[PDB]
Design a protein around this motif. Structure first.
Motif, PDB file in Angstrom:
ATOM      1  N   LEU A  75       0.821  -1.187   0.000  1.00  0.00           N
ATOM      2  CA  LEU A  75       0.000   0.000   0.000  1.00  0.00           C
ATOM      3  C   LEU A  75       0.876   1.267   0.000  1.00  0.00           C
ATOM      4  O   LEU A  75       0.625   2.210  -0.759  1.00  0.00           O
ATOM      5  N   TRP A  76       1.917   1.262   0.825  1.00  0.00           N
ATOM      6  CA  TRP A  76       2.789   2.408   0.993  1.00  0.00           C
ATOM      7  C   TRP A  76       3.620   2.561  -0.231  1.00  0.00           C
ATOM      8  O   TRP A  76       3.756   3.675  -0.711  1.00  0.00           O
ATOM      9  N   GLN A  77       4.124   1.463  -0.775  1.00  0.00           N
ATOM     10  CA  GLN A  77       4.873   1.552  -2.021  1.00  0.00           C
ATOM     11  C   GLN A  77       3.986   2.140  -3.146  1.00  0.00           C
ATOM     12  O   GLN A  77       4.389   3.079  -3.833  1.00  0.00           O
ATOM     13  N   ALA A  78       2.779   1.605  -3.297  1.00  0.00           N
ATOM     14  CA  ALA A  78       1.829   2.102  -4.295  1.00  0.00           C
ATOM     15  C   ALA A  78       1.521   3.578  -4.119  1.00  0.00           C
ATOM     16  O   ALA A  78       1.471   4.298  -5.092  1.00  0.00           O
ATOM     17  N   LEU A  79       1.287   4.019  -2.891  1.00  0.00           N
ATOM     18  CA  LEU A  79       0.935   5.423  -2.629  1.00  0.00           C
ATOM     19  C   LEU A  79       2.088   6.346  -3.065  1.00  0.00           C
ATOM     20  O   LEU A  79       1.876   7.327  -3.751  1.00  0.00           O
ATOM     21  N   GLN A  80       3.319   5.997  -2.704  1.00  0.00           N
ATOM     22  CA  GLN A  80       4.484   6.789  -3.107  1.00  0.00           C
ATOM     23  C   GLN A  80       4.676   6.811  -4.617  1.00  0.00           C
ATOM     24  O   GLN A  80       5.011   7.841  -5.181  1.00  0.00           O
ATOM     25  N   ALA A  81       4.510   5.660  -5.251  1.00  0.00           N
ATOM     26  CA  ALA A  81       4.639   5.553  -6.687  1.00  0.00           C
ATOM     27  C   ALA A  81       3.526   6.342  -7.404  1.00  0.00           C
ATOM     28  O   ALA A  81       3.798   7.130  -8.345  1.00  0.00           O
ATOM     29  N   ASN A  82       2.282   6.149  -6.954  1.00  0.00           N
ATOM     30  CA  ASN A  82       1.150   6.904  -7.497  1.00  0.00           C
ATOM     31  C   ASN A  82       1.369   8.413  -7.333  1.00  0.00           C
ATOM     32  O   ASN A  82       1.112   9.194  -8.258  1.00  0.00           O
TER      33      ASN A  82
END
Lengths: 128, 131
Positions: B92-99
């Protein structure tokens, strides 16, 4: 206030970023939308072709007028319509249609500037 | 010489038909100049981004409130520590940063396109000022 709470927060943050990405996609689409531009170009191009064709027909009318010993342009054509009054209505409609065209054309020439300035100000307001 | 009345009628008919086509082209020109669909779409996109950006920035306070309560640093640092300690938050955290990075780049690209369209608009205005 725990790890599930932090997960909820991340989920929602991610949800907003994703929504923002779709808003960005919409912005890009609007910025790249050239429909109005293509419509304008197409109409301008018609106008140019027709303007050339009319100048050619104007020369044709003048050649006929000169051929008959008459003045060229409106004055000659007025004299042709007096001698051949069956042509009066057609001459009158051409004159009336041309005057409307000239008025409308001058109006669009100003309106182009208006359009460019509307665009310039809307875009410049996004600047900061 | 005598007027060829037939020839003149013919010429005047064709001229008048061209002027009429020209009035139709003028109507099309006006229609194009009045078409603000792209303008309206832009405005709506921009207003949407603003509300979302505002909600996002504020939602950062909830994250910092949670990190602060658990005794962690705020912002990305504390959240890295939290994802390390609670691995189920990793994707989730990886996705949020990438997004988010993706959004920042895209936002920058759109800022550049605004500059491109503004350049073209000024050039177009400069062209009329000449003619």
């Amino acid at each position: 206030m725990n790890s599930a709470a932090l997960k909820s927060c991340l989920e929602r943050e991610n949800a907003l970023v994703v929504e923002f990405l779709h808003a960005l996609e919409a912005e890009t689409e609007a910025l790249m939308d050239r429909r109005a531009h293509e419509s304008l170009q197409a109409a301008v191009q018609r106008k140019e072709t027709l303007a050339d064709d009319l100048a050619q027909l104007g020369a044709e009318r003048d050649a006929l007028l000169s051929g008959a010993g008459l003045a060229s342009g409106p004055a000659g054509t007025d004299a042709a319509a007096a001698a051949h009054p069956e042509l009066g209505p057609l001459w009158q409609a051409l004159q009336a249609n041309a005057a409307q065209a000239r008025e409308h054309n001058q109006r669009n020439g100003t309106l182009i500037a208006v359009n460019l300035r509307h665009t310039q100000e809307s875009l410049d307001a996004l600047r900061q």
